[model samples]
Target chain A: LDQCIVNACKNSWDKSYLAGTPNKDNCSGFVQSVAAELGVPMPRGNANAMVDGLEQSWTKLASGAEAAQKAAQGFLVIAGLKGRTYGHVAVVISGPLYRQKYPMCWCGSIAGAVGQSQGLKSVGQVWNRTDRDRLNYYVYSLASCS
Target chain B: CTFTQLEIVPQFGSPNMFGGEDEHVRVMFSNEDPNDDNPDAFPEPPVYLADRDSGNDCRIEDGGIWSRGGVFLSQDGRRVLMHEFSGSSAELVSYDSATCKVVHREDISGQRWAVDKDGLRLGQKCSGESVDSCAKIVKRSLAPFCQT
Candidate 1:
């Protein structure tokens, strides 16, 4: 399962997938495909619905860092606002741990990117001390496929 | 010692149905004597008019493209970078800080952008027709805005 997630991240890096397009830049599709490979059932939906679907199986981390720290290999990270209709999702390809204040992860957007320390200000990128205080955004983590 | 600086503020307003009039980038200039403290001591700033509305009433949308409208001043304070939407497309505009005149404008298909010490870079996904098409990055230089 761990290697399956790694292979997914490797395949997604620097790849562009258009939203609403099948097997492309869709964040939900990326997560769904990855989870399916591990036999984890992820419902087809947007970032919010993906988070909601995994809520029963995943452990919500306390902070962005905690999410990173606790996320095992193949863990999922989701970001969305309480009231906003749009949000983003990514996978943990490497450490959720900080390096010079950045929590590295693999993310899908207009394209799939690897080792991305920062992206849409809210999710994906682990915020440094100043960014953490300013944005106050958090990431959701899922521990196991089951 | 003398220094020239540019200031930018967003004019407030709600997003119209066409996504226009959501915000206006207001540019101001400051030429002051370092020794002076009076608010009125500085000269009136140059004005760059996009011929849009002007006011302080503004509203930001939850997931609207206009919500991303913003202004960025160059590191040397000679150029002001601002963006606006023309339908689904966006325009990256640069203004001369001293003259408050439009210096350059480019229609960027994508709405996302970033400004750094180097100037402005617009982002877009590469046309997904093939693997060769991936992402496009438009880089514009800020040197012209710095020249007196």
Candidate 2:
């Protein structure tokens, strides 16, 4: 478990979502706050955080333009390919993204989006997983467009 | 880690099939800024490209002999390296060029030999299992290879 890493993320950001039974409400808030701090824009909708023993985060948009910026900050962009659904998310660390991406993401549930980004104001479908107690989020890092 | 050398290979030798062999180059770079949103922030280096000949049978260097790869500093000041290709195997192999020697050999004859570098072996083994199982085993066994 990325207890230390998760705690660090929680400390750097706010974890008000952990107040009651550690449900999605608290976790989603924490995740959104972290994204906001990272300058990652969230699509308009309910950032659902399902209750379970694990956390998985997915992005509403695919191939975020901001993803490269996050990758530079040591965030690993990963994906999960199960059937037709493609889940994506970012795992941030003080170190290089590749080195810390999977561990950090695996510790949490599924986090990320599905479709491509339509524009600055477009919203895509939201996706999450509840397999076992493990987080269902697929993590990845942004690559330079050039 | 410093990249000693980079190698890129193409499966076919038909340059006409592809646009040009110039698309077959291996490149690597050191970024001054690992995280820059503005492309101008990280201007292309003077040595943005490298040219090399692929040992492919075509050896003509017209179609698939060319390889290209490059490294750019990101806004965060980390190195973002990549290799380009058209219709080639484009392998980006790196080594410590100063003290280490890069040996260019192929297994076209199916002859297997042991290669040793930095006390590591570059070889293949047949592990009967699913991709998921192989991935798990490799992941677990190679955990130490990654930077912590």
Candidate 3:
């Protein structure tokens, strides 16, 4: 699964940056590619639509929490500091220590964002740059296990 | 180990790497001699080159299973329900492996399982629902929720 995720992450690196909106359309290709490598069929276009389309393919997930965790582990979520709109998504790779390297960056208002190394230990278990207590914006590690 | 010299070119599906520029090119070299100091000896022509006005074949940016968050095994190796937050009052958009117009929104509101919430984001409390016990139950089921 990790290898499949890595392959999808690598594939999504540049393609995801092309989409200007923060919708699920931009990142679905990587997931679909991963499924294809696993010999499983997946839907293409719109996250919800794809999920609805490939309902049988994801027979592995049994609970909502597990799905959320897998999603966190699969990709790196990038958000605003706070008081701003949530914009940007990247492939979160294992970085030095308990950190991660975001290979791709995408923005909503701007053309796109850039990739960088983020220390998870400094930001705590949660993956984001927001305080969470004071602001309405936050990024999270959809893949990390609790 | 017969290490043959060869020229390789890595191509990206998306053109964002070139800053949305239409004109682009990639070069590769083939190393025919495996014993030579530099295996790469033969230089090939550009892999790709096209003007934005002429070669405007843009790649589609959406659609796939990952984007949809279909049923799958969770990180804990348990069966769980997974999908994207396209409808309702969910913020914080994540990436999917499909093609669509949805961008990656960073405002996470309705996600669950992890302990990163300063307040109630998804509003689904674990007051009575035991997190540990639920994991066990979910594992025992071995079937996806809301699926036949």
Candidate 4:
């Protein structure tokens, strides 16, 4: 994937995901900031709105956690519980972590002390379907076809 | 969110047990941070405390009119905004304010949260990184409590 929004997060995810602070550490907030940094930003909102924006602006790769785990780098896996007010959103970066089918994903706004990981970690290590509930995947690719 | 005093004596009369209506007991709040004190926002605990199944909120053995102490928490259950007793401030290290569920601790020297509403000491940073686990709480409470 080599689109502007994907490249924005891929190039400077560190700038958006600064782990220790509130504005920097949250899920939707970090993703929203990355979108803005791309200069093609969606109106700032939570995961629900982010999901809507992704569907409208970006390309869809696949759906479901298992399918997402099999995707390439620079993709985004989102968890938008439209049925409820709260949800979690994640980003798949350039490098895949070791021993994981899912690429190294940056998930923000996670509650701390889960399975040896904490805020702004990866889906490979965290974000299990057991705990994450529902997840949908998307990718903004360089190619014309998704 | 905003908090304000409410007079229930008129709307539902009073909480009485032949002791003839205890002191007033109806308090309400807004879930919106900026909409504080604005009644049109349809404040929380939507039902009158007098009418709510949560008659006493504190779960003490009284006639349930007092509204007494409680853990006023956010809808997300992420923070414990405050812990109050009889509408006054008190230090409650932890409370599942959403369900009014509390974890009993004798040594709280290791505990991480304390009460201070509206940024006096609000937020997970000020409160603690993790809430009371709340997994120990397994009751399906309209007013739930700790189980295993």
In model 2, the runs with Cα more than 4 Å from the true position are A1-8, A12-14, A17-27, A44-90, A94-103, A106-146, B1-148
lDDT tens digits, residues B25-127, model 1? 3342232213223221111222233322333222211111211225565544555555433112334556654445577666553234555654555555545
lDDT per residue for candidate 3 within B67-137, as digits (tens), equals 11121222221112222222111232222112211333333322232221121123232222123322222
DockQ of 1: 0.03
Question: What is the C-alpha lDDT profile of model 2 across A1-146, one tens digit per residue?
Answer: 22333343445342343333121222244444444444443333222212111133334223323332343344433222221221222233322232112222321221111111111101111111121112233232332111
Error (Å) of candidate 2 at residue B76 is 60
In model 4, what are the clashing residue pairs, if there are any? Answer: B141-B144
lDDT of 3 by residue, A1-146 (tens): 24445554444433432233222333344444444443445455533454444443333333223332344464322222221222222223333322232122222111111012122111111222222112111223233222
**Best by the lDDT measure:** 1
Query: Which prediction has more favorable DockQ, 2 or 3?
Result: 3
Q: Please tell me which model should have the higher lDDT, number 1 or number 2.
A: 1
Q: Give the range where candidate 1 chain B is weakest over 10 consecutive residues by summed lDDT.
A: B58-67
Docking class of 3: incorrect
- Model 3 scores a C-alpha lDDT of 0.26
What TM-score does candidate 1 get on C-alpha atoms?
Answer: 0.41
Q: What docking grade applies to model 4?
A: incorrect
For model 4, the stretches where C-alpha displacement exceeds 4 angstroms are: A1-21, A63-83, A97-101, A113-121, A131-133, A141-146, B1-144
